[PDB]
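Protocol step 4 of 6.
Sequence for Peptide deformylase 3 (Streptococcus pneumoniae) entered exactly as in the expression construct, tag removed. Do not edit the line below.
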Amino acid sequence: SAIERITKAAHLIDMNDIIREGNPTLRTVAEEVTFPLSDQEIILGEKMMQFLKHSQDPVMAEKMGLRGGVGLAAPQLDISKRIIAVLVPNIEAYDLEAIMYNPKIVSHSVQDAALGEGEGCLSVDRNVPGYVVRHARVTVDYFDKDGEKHRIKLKGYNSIVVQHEIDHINGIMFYDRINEKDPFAVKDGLLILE
Ligand SMILES: O=CN(O)CCNC(=O)c1cccc(Cl)c1Cl
Ligand code: NI
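Step 5 output, structure tokens:
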């Protein structure tokens, strides 16, 4: 299985582990994890975070043939579990570093937001221009590796990134949220970031 292969001590996640559009796993709703977590589920989260760190390092990214990422969801590794990793750099070194189990948005703002530069996805080997319309602010519940519950409030980039990853575990892709008619339409209440 993907999870057994990926969580071997020796395994380094790379682009060959990441499934792409057309693979039905990306359009499936991922299964909640149960507590306590298995060793494999804990290792998986750690491997995912390690990947993000590798992807954000000039030398390692070059060597491993990695595209940079600020988030990753297990379904991207063909693992249909509700596990995501988020690694958003500050302009510590990170605005947000978290491995989240069963993350869930429990509140969101009326105001929407979108990155002015649009979004991309490691599972999408093409550019899809347009404003990816999301909630400006979210309150997110999740469990950490110890089954401890966290409730965090996110805004700006962090909010966008976490929503992108939660979308994956719900079978949603970033372009599902771009206005087909006018990709760069600026609706009332839409905050353009950057
Ligand atoms: O699911 C995660 N990925 O596919 C990694 C590649 N995309 C990104 O890092 C990314 C890029 C721009 C905006 C957002 Cl919100 C994200 Cl998440
Ligand atoms: Ni993605």
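Step 6, annotate. The radius of gyration is 16 Å.
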